[PDB]
């Protein structure tokens, strides 16, 4: 939720409960992390050497090995602290939304006709296909599709906003999520999901799931870290036969300390934390994802595909206009519009029957049982007509009316095209109502653009993402809406087959494709797009076919999705570069310290002017232990991604992190050695 | 002296980039499966006679073909060296080689290493130096050019499954890139004084009154392909110090040009096949910057030279010990960097007699994987591994999926690249460790102190990285040394060939994504510096603790 942006990393309440979860990670759950399993093996080895040297082993400096082993255990402790902190923040964000199903007061109907049934069925005894009647003030038990009634529910417990959203029967606002409070009159809801397989449990499996599979970028980074661990283990283990000939061989504890200081422990301990922190930040951005693979797929996105009615605009388009044409009087303005849209459950149809009726008191028509048979609305046909009697009343926009009715000889005249164009100038959806070969005229549907999305589309253009509209509506008012919204281009009069064709064409070029849709007709589009974002106000088919589901109903949520998906990869790469560049100063600290009795001439390599060999090794190990806990906030927050050019971004990240990993370990080791000398421990 | 060295490096790189661009354009035709002008018809009759149908084969069949030819040549060479007393063209009566020496110098010449633990004039006959150790000089070079041809074909082909024809590639390379060039190079060597004959050893009544026996043989024919294929297998004990092998400074300059000729032409062809010359220019810049820094460091170290020379009463402190008088310390330093960065291994001078700092840089240039203007084929597909790590890191730290030339770099070729870049540091570290705990490996040590471990490390590095250059103070004719180095060469070539082959087979199936605005450019000074830093850091973080007990300890002692 966005009512609280993020829980504090150190609130002094979960820190003590997740530090106790570290000692539970000390036993061999480290088997799945090879770098820190190497650190664990070295820590146990150094502890055994320290105990044996206290008891009866040949060397005598047991305190040095004890301190080395203690700090190597502290390194594992801090790595598990980072992992447990990320997982505990994830579990806290989970528990903040898992307690939304407080009460279970659902009545299961036997017939869906608004009443004649009242039960006391708990919400856990509801399956797919159970009609539920909810009065206002109650909460919604199940994630169900509304089949009757219109109400303004409040999805506060899911979205985090106080702004009510209206739900209706069919069309766009048919699907509602359970656990939310209806506020206005009533709703008849029919559940479509089994227990366990719900949207709340999808969020649960997203965030609190500790069995998180690794994304292929994390897998390849882990492979690279394993290769670095192998070369450093070999270069360290071969030092004993190399230095054994030229005098006295180096101590095994010194080799283990150098091995831990060399292997990428900084990224090795935070790699598990970066993914969980990214998913937690995505929960902070109100995006519900199936897995982190689709989240990281947003880094390569350069084209984005919205809609017009549901996505960019609110989708209501409730309006009442007239027809100034020949043969059409004031009664004739809406004699046929209400007749065509009586049995129409779309928001446009109900807006017609509640707006064009009150303008002239046209409530003469009763219920459609009195000799009326209608046809359903389908985007393939683009028509919502009715065969009420011998002559029919149909409702299309530009081409459906032509290709279906106007090929019957009675072609429509030109005098209505100018009025259609005048309607489309203002940004209203034109519906043309026709009586057989005679045309009544056109009515307008003023749709409101959602918020100030022009700045967000400018940001998307700045990030190198081409935002182009797909819609199946008239080309002129779609052009006006595109000009008012600020998108790059548009493609109007598109069937869902054409949407799929455009997605496949853009994928065949070699570009990753992002789709943001909400309607039922957008389900094959979201099932084929690489990065599919589903609107919360949309339909269950779209929310189940899309890879990700939005919550706060922002059309430009790809900005936050791209930011977080890029931030995870950039954090991983920057921490890897920092860990690799630290090894230069680790070498400059340990190699003259390690070879102080074998080759005394190597003391000229002590460019840090460190006090003692043991002090230098201890300072390097202490810095290795402390850099992980100092970079815990960076792993949790992610790096500061600024939308620059790729080359400029590489230059800035190199300048910060590679140069930092080359320089600040020198300062850190020198400061730690100075504190050790001041305290007198060495 | 600094101006003389600058002029030498400048004219060497200038003549190299002038000469290698037409050869790169010629090799791009062989990569693109287009016959060279005038070769059509001849190739038709030759392939019909040899049964080569010119059929496209996948990575498994290409790798199996390369490995099968390399083991067939290994068997032929090994039994030829064992039975060299029963073969003609033997003016002396040198016996057949022992099993250890024969296996070592068979695997060395098959694996493009050409390490010689023997003396050529008193070890092998003319047949053993001509029908073997020169046929393998051609074939080991062709078997690397074929692998880099397959890798470039994989990088340039879209959604295919077959690389090419290994037999067509090998025949085309050996008959039209290697033989017609090494013929002219050998003729110039005979012009300047190199041997080409089959006479018996010539007894000499010297001026003073002593006796010496001049060794003869087909020297120039082997020397030309030795330089051209980056082989490094000298006819005599001194690879390029022998006046019968490297008579003049013009000959030595042509030797350096032949060493860097095909590795530079392969980068030019890599640039030309993709249609983006900037990629090959990026590779050449990344190689040349490291090469110039290494050359300058080695020249300055050798000019500083022995500090004890000026104290003992000589004219200067210049280290001319272990160097020829025909070549300055500048020329010897440049050739020493060339032959150890290029995986050649032919010595103009005694790298043992080199100073500590001037011998450290050849070690590390070998140990980084021979990627800086490296071996033929292997200096480009070894550099592509560092390119894949560089693009992986860069794509991560800019926030995109890693890619090079459009093709994404996913988990499979990330594993394969990790293994390929992992094989040779593993081999050199385990080999040097095994040599330093065994008395049979420690007994070959000649110089005391850290320089003996420097000898052992240099030997294992050159064996594992297919260089073959030696300090030669290491008496590595023992069976333990022969078997260990032969294992190192075999694994160090054929455990980097197999993962690169699998990388090619994983990259043919992909499609090159179109160059968008957000994609990172894999050229320019930023990516040149990134690739240079990746190489200079990955190769250093492995070998600083190893080099610290050797040349660094010797230098600071």
């Amino acid at each position: 939720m966005s009512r609280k942006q993020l829980a504090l990393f150190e609130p002094t309440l979960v820190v003590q409960a997740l530090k106790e979860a570290v000692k539970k990670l000390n036993p061999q759950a480290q088997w799945r992390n090879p770098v820190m399993f190497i650190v664990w093996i070295g820590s146990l080895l150094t502890t055994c050497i320290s105990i044996a040297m206290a008891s009866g082993a040949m060397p005598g400096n047991a305190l040095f090995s004890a301190a080395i082993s203690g700090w190597l255990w502290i390194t594992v402790l801090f790595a598990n602290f980072a992992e447990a902190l990320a997982e505990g923040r994830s579990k806290a964000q989970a528990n903040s939304l898992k307690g939304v199903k407080k009460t279970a007061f659902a009545r299961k109907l036997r017939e869906p006709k608004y009443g004649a049934a009242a039960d006391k069925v708990p919400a856990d005894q509801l399956r797919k296909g159970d009609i539920v009647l909810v009065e206002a003030g109650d909460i919604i038990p199940c994630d169900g599709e509304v089949i009757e009634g219109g109400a303004s529910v409040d999805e506060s417990a899911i979205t985090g906003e106080s702004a009510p959203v209206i739900r209706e029967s069919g069309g766009d606002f048919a699907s509602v999520t359970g656990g939310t409070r209806i506020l206005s009159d009533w709703l008849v809801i029919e559940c479509s999901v089994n227990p366990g397989e719900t949207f709340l449990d999808r969020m649960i499996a997203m965030v609190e799931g500790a069995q998180r599979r690794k994304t292929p970028n994390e897998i390849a980074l882990t492979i690279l870290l394993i290769a670095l661990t192998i070369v450093f283990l070999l270069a360290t283990a071969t030092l004993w036969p190399f230095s054994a000939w030229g005098g006295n061989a180096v101590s095994v504890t010194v080799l283990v300390a150098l091995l831990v200081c060399l292997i990428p422990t900084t990224i090795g301990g935070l790699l598990s934390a970066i993914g969980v922190a990214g998913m937690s930040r995505m929960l902070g951005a109100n995006v519900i994802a199936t897995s982190g693979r689709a989240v990281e797929a947003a880094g390569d996105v350069d084209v984005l595909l919205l809609n017009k009615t549901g996505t960019i605009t609110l989708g209501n388009r409730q309006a009442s206009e007239f027809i100034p044409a020949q043969g059409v009087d004031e009664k004739t303005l809406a004699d046929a519009a209400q007749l065509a849209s009586l049995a129409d459950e779309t928001p446009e149809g109900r807006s017609i029957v509640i707006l064009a009726k009150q303008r002239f008191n046209l409530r003469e028509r009763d219920v459609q049982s009195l000799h009326a048979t209608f046809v359903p609305f389908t985007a393939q046909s683009r028509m919502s007509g009715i065969n009420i009697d011998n002559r029919m009343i149909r409702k299309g926009s530009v081409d459906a009316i032509r290709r279906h009715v106007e090929a019957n000889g009675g072609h429509f005249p030109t005098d209505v095209d100018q009025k259609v164009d005048q309607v489309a100038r203002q940004g209203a959806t034109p519906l043309v109502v026709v009586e057989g070969s005679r045309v009544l005229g056109v009515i307008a549907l003023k749709d409101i653009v959602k918020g100030g999305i022009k700045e967000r589309f400018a940001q998307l253009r700045k990030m190198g993402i081409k935002t182009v509209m797909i819609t199946g509506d008239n080309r002129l008012t779609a052009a006006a809406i595109a000009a008012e919204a600020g998108v790059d281009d548009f493609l109007a009069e598109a069937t869902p087959e054409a949407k799929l064709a455009l997605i496949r064409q853009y994928q065949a070029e070699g570009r990753l494709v992002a789709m943001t849709g909400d309607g039922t007709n957008d389900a094959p589009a979201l099932a084929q797009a690489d990065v599919a974002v589903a609107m919360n106000s949309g339909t269950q088919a779209a929310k189940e076919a899309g890879n990700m589901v939005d919550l706060d109903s922002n059309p430009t949520k790809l900005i936050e999705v791209v930011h977080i998906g890029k931030q995870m990869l950039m954090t991983r790469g920057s921490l890897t570069t920092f860990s690799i560049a630290n090894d230069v100063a680790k070498y400059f600290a340990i190699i003259p310290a390690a070879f102080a009795a074998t080759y005394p001439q190597l003391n000229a390599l002590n460019i840090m002017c460190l006090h003692s060999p043991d002090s230098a090794i201890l300072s390097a190990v202490i810095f290795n232990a402390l850099i992980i806990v100092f970079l815990i906030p960076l792993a949790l927050k992610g790096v500061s991604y600024k939308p620059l050019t790729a080359s400029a971004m590489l230059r800035r990240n190199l300048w910060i992190y590679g140069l930092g990993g080359l320089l600040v370990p020198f300062i850190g080791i020198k400061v730690i050695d100075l504190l050790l000398t001041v305290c007198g421990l060495v | 002296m600094a101006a003389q060295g600058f002029l030498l490096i400048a004219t060497f790189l200038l003549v190299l980039m002038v000469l290698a661009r037409p050869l790169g354009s010629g090799l791009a035709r062989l990569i693109n499966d287009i016959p060279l002008p005038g070769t059509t018809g001849v190739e038709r009759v030759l392939f019909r006679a040899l049964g080569v149908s010119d059929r496209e084969m996948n990575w498994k069949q290409y790798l199996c073909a390369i490995l099968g030819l390399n083991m067939l040549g290994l068997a032929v060479l090994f039994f030829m060296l064992l039975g060299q007393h029963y073969l003609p063209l033997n003016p002396q009566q040198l016996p057949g080689l022992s099993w250890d020496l024969a296996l070592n110098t068979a695997v060395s010449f098959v694996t493009n290493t050409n390490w010689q633990s023997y003396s050529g004039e008193t070890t092998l006959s003319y047949f053993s130096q001509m029908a073997g150790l020169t046929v393998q000089n051609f074939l080991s070079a062709a078997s690397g050019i074929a692998v880099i041809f397959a890798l470039i074909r994989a990088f340039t082909r879209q959604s295919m499954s077959t690389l090419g024809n290994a037999w067509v590639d090998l025949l085309r390379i050996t008959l039209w890139v290697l033989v017609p060039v090494a013929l002219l190079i050998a003729l110039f060597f005979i012009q300047q004084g190199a041997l080409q004959n089959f006479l018996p050893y010539q007894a000499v009544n010297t001026v003073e009154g002593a006796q010496q026996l001049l060794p003869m043989g087909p020297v120039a024919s082997q020397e030309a392909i030795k330089m051209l294929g980056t082989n490094g297998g000298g006819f005599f004990n001194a690879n390029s110090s022998h006046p019968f092998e490297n008579p003049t400074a013009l000959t030595n300059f042509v030797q350096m040009l032949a060493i860097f000729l095909i590795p530079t032409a392969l980068c030019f062809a890599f640039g030309e096949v993709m249609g983006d010359r900037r990629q090959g220019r990026m590779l050449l810049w990344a190689m040349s910057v490291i090469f110039v820094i290494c050359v300058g460091v080695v020249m300055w170290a050798e000019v500083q030279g022995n500090p004890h020379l000026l104290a003992l009463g000589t004219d200067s402190s210049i280290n001319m010990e272990g160097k020829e008088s025909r070549f300055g310390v500048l020329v010897s330093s440049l050739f020493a960097v060339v032959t150890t960065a290029a995986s050649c291994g032919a010595v103009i001078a005694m790298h043992d007699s080199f100073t500590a700092l001037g011998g450290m840089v050849p070690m590390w240039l070998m140990q980084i994987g021979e990627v800086v203007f490296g071996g033929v084929g292997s200096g480009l597909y070894g550099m592509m591994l560092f390119v894949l790590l560089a693009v992986f890191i860069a794509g991560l730290m800019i926030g995109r999926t890693p890619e090079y030339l459009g093709k994404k770099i996913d988990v499979r070729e990330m594993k394969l690249t990790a293994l390929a870049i992992l094989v040779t540091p593993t081999l050199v570290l385990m080999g040097a460790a095994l040599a330093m705990m065994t008395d049979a490996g420690r007994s070959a040590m000649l110089n005391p102190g850290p320089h003996g471990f420097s000898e052992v490390l240099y030997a294992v590095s050159s064996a594992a990285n297919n260089n073959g250059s030696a300090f030669a103070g290491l008496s590595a004719n023992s069976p333990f040394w022969n078997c260990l180095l032969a294992f190192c060469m075999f694994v160090g070539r054929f455990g980097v060939i197999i993962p690169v082959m699998a990388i090619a087979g994983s990259l043919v199936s992909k499609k090159s994504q179109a160059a968008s605005s957000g994609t990172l450019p894999t050229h320019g000074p930023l990516f040149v510096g990134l690739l240079i830093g990746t190489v200079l850091l990955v190769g250093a973080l492995t070998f600083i603790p190893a080099l610290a007990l050797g040349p660094v300890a010797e230098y600071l002692s």
Binding site: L233, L234, V252 | -
Partner: peptide, 27 residues
């Protein structure tokens, strides 16, 4: 070469084998 060298070489070999197995696997 005593037991303290033999067990060190054996443990380094075991760690290398474990790391190579972890490199090949996608655990």
């Amino acid at each position: 070469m005593s037991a303290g060298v033999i067990t060190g070489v054996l443990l380094v070999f075991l760690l290398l084998g474990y790391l190579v197995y972890a490199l090949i696997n996608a655990e």
